[PDB]
Symmetry: D2
Subunit: 501 residues, 4 copies
């Protein structure tokens, strides 16, 4: 069987070996990276069914990230299977500042009264909490009395009951017992802090990433089309127009402007962590279903991500609720699922990938009977639409082992992908950028080949590759779809059903 | 603007000129056929939408029929358009014998008692009626007391009330006021007169016909598959495998065995004349609809025939009932309509064709909304069915001006024909037998061309021909369907939607 | 076994006995109506499936029509079954005037040149034709050069090639060999002769008719809603609100304004005679199907009329084309079929009815599989529509022998009628006007009974009547539908499936 | 809005107050129960939307359980809303024995070798583990070499590599690092230990429960129909035939025999805990979907249960994966969801109920567009089926606020429940057993009322109750469904749509 649902695995130290020393062993950070040993460990993740690696630019300097990408390049060589490179921007993050006296955290109780400091550069005390705002913004005038400041995944709330113009501070009340640790996430819902469309740090992060060579960018805290287009401008400036941009919907502004953001972007990442704090917690499953449906209708790529298998950071087997969650992400019709901590810094990086894939394959057995995605709802008054519909009805009506595309831009592959055929899709292409850019599209198995001389040659090549890759043998039925001639920039116009000789 | 429903026109004297004298004028039969001027009259029928000519071998010797076929051959050259040649067998006909004293007809009254003579060779009297049974069969032992002998289209009935073994005669009672003319048809329902599967006259008629060159044969009074296969054997023997056989369903045995007859034959002719006498009169519309449905499901050709525009034999304009009748034949999904008397020996042969075509085109504008044929009912587990389904859905979903196919055997053209696309079907072929054999298939325009070297050449040829024939112009969308490669004996597997340059 | 399609039979002399003498026998017109023996003949029509009688006020004075209505009243008492009374208006008819010298008809040839006289009161000559225009209108100023004057069912055409202002005449050319007899119909297509919305003769005809007691009125040559409302006003004035008005669509203005006419009227009569002359002949089947569809969607009654079984005027058995025509009227979803000449002044009035019913019952066995009416197309946002839908689905899903309704206004019966259930509809009512007014609605069997005291009593009455009428026996399933309470003016809201005890 | 999805809450100490002392405070078990104070706390759970309480007979003696049920009886009085009483059997549980020297647990490492003791009565050592098998069964001959013994929720595995016939012990290897605590669950998959269909302890538990008064029984570890029928026998013996039996599918034998078990039982409980250990972990979501679908098709009740909101035992807010899991249980079309530990012994009993309900209401907003259950797939050739389908289509086609049933046995309520109307269902009934037995049926709001005298009275009562309960006001549309007359034992036959006056 072929895992049709794509996997994004966040890379980190959990895979990286230093002087024969694994993550957790003391003075690990002291020793230097063994590139060969980690690449061998990364190769086991690729084999486990990871399709793309995520470089989270919230943590790690350019040296750290760029070296990691160099290791993956060699890991591809060991496994002999390519994968996509995804960069994740820090964006307008707010964190709790460091504590005076190397205090790591403090405990509070409900009813307690404390202050939050809007001044930048200063350290935290138990009595006053200093915020690290990205790009050193003053947020004093942008958060009002009665607003809510949340710390460590929204687990601890502080209600703003007064502002002091004298010190530019917020007087807050502790809503529940909890811990305020240093370097923890801060969220302030139902606010519009005037963060730039593009902050200078994120410009640098992307430019550094584009220089190393990336296939994707996930833009954090996308509020509007403007935020996506400011990144698009850089990609086109640097001669990286092939880079596909995922808007991360992390907040209410993102949901309100979802329609214009989906138009602007090449896909969406459902960022459930930040989203769960910013909107009612019991409403995240509603937005997850709605968002996947609309992105699919735009023919674009959706990633369901964050806390998919949270517990496997610490424990070898997931909870029944995590397994259910990953299971229904496939049944809503997500293109891709994402491991963040599980693969970056947990104790079970390879098992988390193996757990996620096995669930992904089991759900795809139930897609036919239970799948929430419907191809019938789509418009059918255009040549591409009737041609895709005919391919899907083929796979519906017969035992079709494989749909085989020859695609210059990969357009045909995204078209058939969108219709969710009851078959694996071979996407044959003529350049590596197009090959690696198709890695997150549902059911699509990208393969590099030589351009065809003619339509008959095209049909020869398609059968020859699928047979050589071992995907089909004699007696198996395949569908061959293309914009003929493939060399010219024409959209899908041709379909051929072939019994493999 | 392209008549999708085919027209079968019965040929006869009505078009034939003799010493410059039209049929009806004084001593016409004396003078010889002015072939050239006759062919001009047949040419105008073709130009007015006739697609096939019927040679009814019930009337006319071989010299008469063979001459007529020669005239049509020259008529196509005048028109510069080809048509199919259909032979209709006499079959197991019963007729009233000639009258003593050159009397033409006799009048009877209800309650009158008379006799019917089973002896062959003898003449008719007013008081005793002699039957001309095909091949001089004795029917005394095959007709029972209480059976019913019908004369002149079942307009006059005679009940058998007694048999006389001495004279081998039937004592009959006249059941309604009516005329018994000489040479009128005789029908006996609910009987099994043991006529041979193939009678010696019909073997010779077909052999003569096959020698001249015919594309179709209509077998009269088909009771069983056996009757069809006896004719099939001759076609195989003589090297005429390409000849397509229509079973004429003219009787109860034919209705009961319709399923095995449809398997045996290449299509059906609904013979409403004989059928109306043999079955309840008010049940003819039930059998017409049922038969069309089943023949379509077998992918074969159905012809609705007899009294389609009866009154246009005598009068320039048809009745509103006749216009209705031809109209609903198209809406039940007949491949073809047939004029018998209107074109063979009527006063308005050309007007009958013109009236029939205009009705045919009007009905075809209502086929989409009101058509009683449903292509969704068909099985869809095979590559021909999914490929035809995709062609039909294309024409459903877009403005498709033309479906174009390249077919060696014509299989693809019959396949798309069966699915009744909302488009004209250009069927490009490589031999005249295949061209002429496609002439009765719904919506199919057969055209001869050269075989394609390659699949891309195939796509070039299809667009080039449809543009040259004036069927499509620049900007128009076409579908191209084929079994690739066209030279190999493989069924339909390839579909291309092409914007005509 | 219950004829669902209603029959309208035109009454006339063909059934009327005079001094024991049938119509046709010597000096028939001299002798007086033997009412009792005539009523016996009308009784056998009702028994053979006539549901309504048509009094055509084009021919016959008030004395003649009023006597006929009296005979039908006594005919129902002989049959012990009731029927509806339909009056047909003369309307803006044009006829050829009487000939000088008691000449009955004259023969012309193509290319002949003659004149048509616009003066009123004058007689016809062979060389000059005088028109009898209803209400003595001058049509000289309302007909243009190049227009076409048709005589005897549009069988003979005269082209207006010149006008003479001096004599106020049209110079015409005979366009085909044909007869101009006296008292024959005259038609001028593509004209707006300014006939009044309601002419004084038709006001008096209706007033006379309403006085006798009629259930329906067919308004001839309806051009607009205005023409229908002028008649509506009289029905309201005279306390005859219950009279249901059928617009006869006889012309182009009627076709164009069909939408506003269907809103104004209680149903439509498809008048194929006049319509065939006024519109292209081969377009009559298009308008018949379209009109039936729209009238059904308005929940109203459609009657397909004229030349349904033409030949049975002269001959005992119809043509196969006529049987086809009446057959497809039922399959297009006509509520009723109408014999005009066949029952009014033909040799086979009772046989015509018997032939028509037998065809009607045969077609109704094919309505489920082939019926071109679709009740799924109807809007479903209201409680009547969901309630009717549920009744139709009940009859679809189970063997429902009968639908039984109790209706004060008859609204529920028209509702279920509109949805064309696969069941007979017993409509129990509380007054004769409502009983007789339901007689032309498809599948509805009107029966008088006593109002119910309660909903449970309603369910008792419905089962008791259907058992007593012999429509259902023990073990049979029925559906009971009503607007509860039946006494209150409320639309259908209640449905009960009952196994008959 | 009305929570349509039912909630089962497991009751326990977390709600019970002892000498003003809550669970966790030391020497709590010492003090006696305050009945009034706990009932006040249980009343807040009922208000929070708990519909049924589960008494888990694995933990607590008869004194403890029977007192708890007495408290709930008073809690109903405080809240003034009734709930169902569900008893859960211990069944063939295997637990780890107590440890010598009051050792609470021991730590092992992979590769370690230890023995498992099949002798009963004996205590545990670190070197030898003693099993507490229900009813003191010898399992030595029923578990084979190569089998797998799992402890604490299958988190620690021991592979059987040898059997010692001398001591009747299993030689085992530790598969993973883990803890073996005392009184922890033991599972041995792919074994058929010959536990009785009914063990003497479970007979006593049920008989004690039936005496106190229960509405439901959940039978643990159902393998076959036989296991369900042995409990059915007791219910009928004791005059408790109204008690509804849920088979808990906890094992492979249960899944293999699911069809015969669903026939035998009144519903199913998906017991995900035991099931997750007994079958592949990644396959629990597959069995959850399949099981819900089949139970629905049988018209029976399904409960999705175990670890629905696990983390809320310790923490005030659930994980995003738990919220997703509870969300998709509603979207698969579960009748009911279940809290076990969360409500029995966690720190957040009332918040767990409130969390579960809020999720349940949010999912039911998405049931219309995304619901996996389909009413169209059901048979429709029976009176009840067409009547339910008509009710569902009503709610589909209009804004129906409420479906109102009057039901003697509650049959009509289960019928409409099964079709999952887009409306709340008032189930009006005449006895408390029927009222409390309907509490776990999806969307059903049970209410006691007086029997109706007549059908009209029935329609009065239905509107009057729904208006008095505040469920509908003037202008709101309701559907009233019943087997008329309601007093007689007849299945559903009547439907009425009423605008609330
Ligand atoms: Mg985030
Ligand atoms: Mg014949
Ligand atoms: Mg008229
Ligand atoms: Mg369990």
């Amino acid at each position: 069987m072929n895992k049709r649902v794509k996997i994004v695995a966040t890379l980190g130290p959990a895979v990286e070996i230093r002087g024969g020393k694994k993550f957790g062993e003391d003075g690990y950070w002291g020793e230097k990276l063994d590139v060969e040993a980690s690449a061998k460990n990364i190769a086991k993740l690729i084999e486990a069914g990871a399709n793309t690696f995520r470089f989270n630019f919230s943590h790690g300097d350019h040296q750290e990230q760029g070296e990691r990408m160099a290791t993956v390049k060699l890991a591809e060589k060991i496994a002999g299977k390519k994968v996509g490179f995804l960069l994740d921007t820090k964006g307008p993050e707010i964190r709790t500042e460091l504590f005076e006296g190397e205090a790591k955290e403090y405990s509070y109780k409900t009813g307690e009264k404390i202050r939050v400091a809007t001044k930048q550069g200063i350290k935290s005390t138990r009595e006053v909490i200093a915020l690290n705002v990205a790009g050193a913004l003053d947020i004093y005038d942008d958060v009002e009395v009665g607003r809510q400041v949340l710390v460590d995944d929204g687990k601890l709330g502080l209600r703003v009951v007064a502002k002091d113009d004298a010190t530019r501070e917020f007087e807050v009340e502790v809503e529940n017992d909890g811990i305020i640790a240093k370097q923890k996430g801060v969220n302030i819902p139902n606010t519009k802090i005037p963060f730039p469309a593009l902050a200078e740090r994120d410009n640098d992060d992307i430019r550094f990433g584009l220089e190393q060579g990336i296939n994707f960018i996930a833009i954090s805290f996308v509020r509007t089309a403007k935020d996506v287009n400011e990144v698009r401008a850089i990609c086109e400036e640097t001669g990286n127009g092939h880079v596909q941009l995922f808007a991360k919907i992390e907040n209410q502004q993102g949901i309100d402007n979802l329609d214009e953001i989906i138009e602007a972007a090449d896909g969406i990442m459902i960022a459930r962590g930040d989203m769960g704090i910013e909107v009612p917690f019991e409403m995240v499953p509603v937005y997850q279903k709605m968002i996947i449906k609309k992105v699919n209708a735009a023919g674009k790529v959706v990633i369901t991500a964050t806390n998919m298998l949270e517990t496997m950071t610490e424990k070898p087997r997931a909870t029944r609720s995590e397994v259910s969650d990953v299971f229904n992400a496939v049944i809503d019709g997500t293109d891709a699922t994402m491991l963040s901590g599980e693969s970056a810094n947990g104790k079970y990086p390879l098992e988390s990938v193996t757990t996620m894939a096995t669930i992904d394959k089991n759900a795809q057995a139930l897609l036919n009977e239970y799948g929430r995605l419907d191809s019938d709802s789509f418009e059918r008054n255009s040549k591409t639409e009737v041609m895709a519909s005919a391919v899907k009805d083929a796979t519906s009506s017969m035992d079709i082992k494989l749909v085989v595309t020859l695609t210059k831009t990969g357009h045909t592959a995204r078209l058939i992908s969108k219709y969710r055929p009851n078959a694996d899709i071979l996407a044959l292409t003529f350049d590596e950028l197009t090959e690696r850019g198709l890695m997150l599209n549902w059911g699509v198995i990208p393969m590099l080949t030589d351009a065809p001389s003619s339509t008959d040659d095209m049909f020869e090549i398609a059968e020859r590759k699928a047979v050589e890759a071992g995907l089909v043998e004699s007696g198996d039925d395949i569908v061959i779809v293309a914009g003929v001639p493939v060399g010219e920039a024409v959209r899908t116009n041709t379909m051929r059903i072939r019994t493999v000789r």
